[PDB]
């Protein structure tokens, strides 16, 4: 399988397994959901009837008052009482089998190629750490919402991309499944494609 | 936490190849003189747990 470079107009050979496989929606869905679950902080709590501030005194005697029987001022039935099943901090992260993670990335990358959302270049860089330069470069390439994957992340390109919310600049080791789907186009350097090829195999 | 085995059940049942349980027969501990040799002979080999009882045994032995 071959992908033509836009600037150079050569032919970078790639594996059919990585860049030409069928889209496994069910697999991709699981990995994308797991990724979003991994982002959750899970920091919260409420107070059970044990944790609400107050006395353990029985509010009124069991029998004879003509009132419903009461035991705790902290009862979840009562205003100001405990939460029946009060939350605690939770870890929402899921296991993703290594092979399912890698399988999902190969499905995603293959689908980006089929949809013409993967753009391979020989090189992508800026002269100075200047946002205006990168903004002009993306205008020249007819790019707007773009994930740029480099083999080695340039400091000038990092700093130039930082204030453009539509643009993100990654190393090949820092690819994630959600980002490949989320951005409209994915620009990869030739060197990045080889590292991703080697990573997924 | 981990389920705890009912340790008394683990001393009385062993899991077989197809997932049944073997046990030792009752009635061969004592008061043996009055029992016929035939009856005792048939109580010597291990037996399989019956269908009605498998649910009870499985509950007791989650790591069988």
């Amino acid at each position: 399988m071959e992908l033509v470079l836009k600037d150079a107009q050569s032919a970078l050979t790639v594996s059919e397994t990585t860049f030409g496989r069928d889209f496994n929606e069910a697999l991709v869905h699981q990995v994308v959901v797991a990724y979003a679950a991994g982002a959750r902080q899970g920091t919260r709590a409420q107070k059970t009837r044990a944790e609400v501030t107050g006395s353990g005194k029985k509010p009124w005697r069991q029998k004879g008052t003509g009132r419903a029987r009461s035991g705790s001022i902290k009862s979840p039935i009562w205003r100001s009482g405990g939460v029946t099943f009060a939350a605690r901090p939770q870890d929402h992260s899921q296991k993703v089998n290594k092979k399912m993670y890698r399988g999902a990335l190969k499905s995603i990358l293959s689908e980006l190629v089929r949809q013409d959302r993967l753009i391979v270049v020989e090189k992508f860089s800026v002269e100075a750490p200047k946002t205006k330069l990168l903004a002009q470069k993306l205008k020249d390439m007819a790019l707007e919402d773009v994930l740029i994957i480099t083999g080695e992340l340039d400091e000038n390109l990092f700093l130039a991309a930082r204030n453009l919310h539509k643009v993100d600049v990654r190393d090949a080791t820092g690819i994630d499944p959600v980002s490949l789907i989320a951005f409209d186009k994915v620009v990869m350097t030739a060197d990045a494609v080889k590292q991703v090829e080697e990573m997924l195999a | 936490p981990k389920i705890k085995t009912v340790r008394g059940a683990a001393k009385r049942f062993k899991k077989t190849g197809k997932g049944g349980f073997k046990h030792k027969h009752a009635n061969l501990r004592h008061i043996l003189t009055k029992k016929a040799t035939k009856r005792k002979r048939h109580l010597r080999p291990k037996a399989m747990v019956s269908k009605g009882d498998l649910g009870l045994v499985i509950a007791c032995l989650p790591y069988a």
């Binding site: 929606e25 069910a26 | 009912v6």
Partner: protein, 144 residues
């Protein structure tokens, strides 16, 4: 392929039961617990093996046997494991290095399970009659 065009496989995500949310649900009111008794109660239900007070099965049957400490340090090797070692000599140490047996295993037996299709020297392991024939038929040898 967008974040709002991904769906789970059909059948992969069944909705959980929610008890006590009205007539239409089919689990309203009693929440599938029926009427009264110990099993209807919060925290209600009898322990594992309890039979209502009748001497339970795991107490009316006798204990038997003892546990062998030697069995815990004895392993079985399949013929399919013999090729997995490095360098064509099968002994305890090479089996341990290949992650075939645990490090505390002191005794091992090769059994007729799977196939051996290469000459292997087996040294210091017991071998079954059938495994011996299979190893020797593949040009192997067995050393006590």
């Amino acid at each position: 392929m967008r974040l709002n065009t991904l769906s789970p496989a059909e059948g992969s995500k069944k909705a959980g039961k929610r008890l006590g949310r009205g007539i239409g649900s089919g689990l309203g009111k009693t929440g599938g617990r029926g009427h009264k008794g110990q099993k209807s109660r919060s925290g209600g239900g009898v322990r594992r093996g309890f039979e209502g007070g009748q001497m339970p099965l795991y107490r009316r049957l006798p204990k038997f046997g003892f546990t062998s400490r030697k069995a815990a340090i004895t392993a079985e090797i399949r013929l399919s494991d013999l090729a997995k070692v490095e360098g064509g000599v099968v002994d305890l140490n090479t089996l341990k290095a290949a992650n075939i047996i645990g490090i505390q295993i002191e005794f091992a037996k090769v059994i007729l399970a799977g196939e051996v299709t290469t000459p292997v020297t087996v040294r210091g392991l017991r071998v079954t009659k059938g495994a011996r024939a299979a190893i020797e038929a593949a040009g192997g040898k067995i050393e006590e």
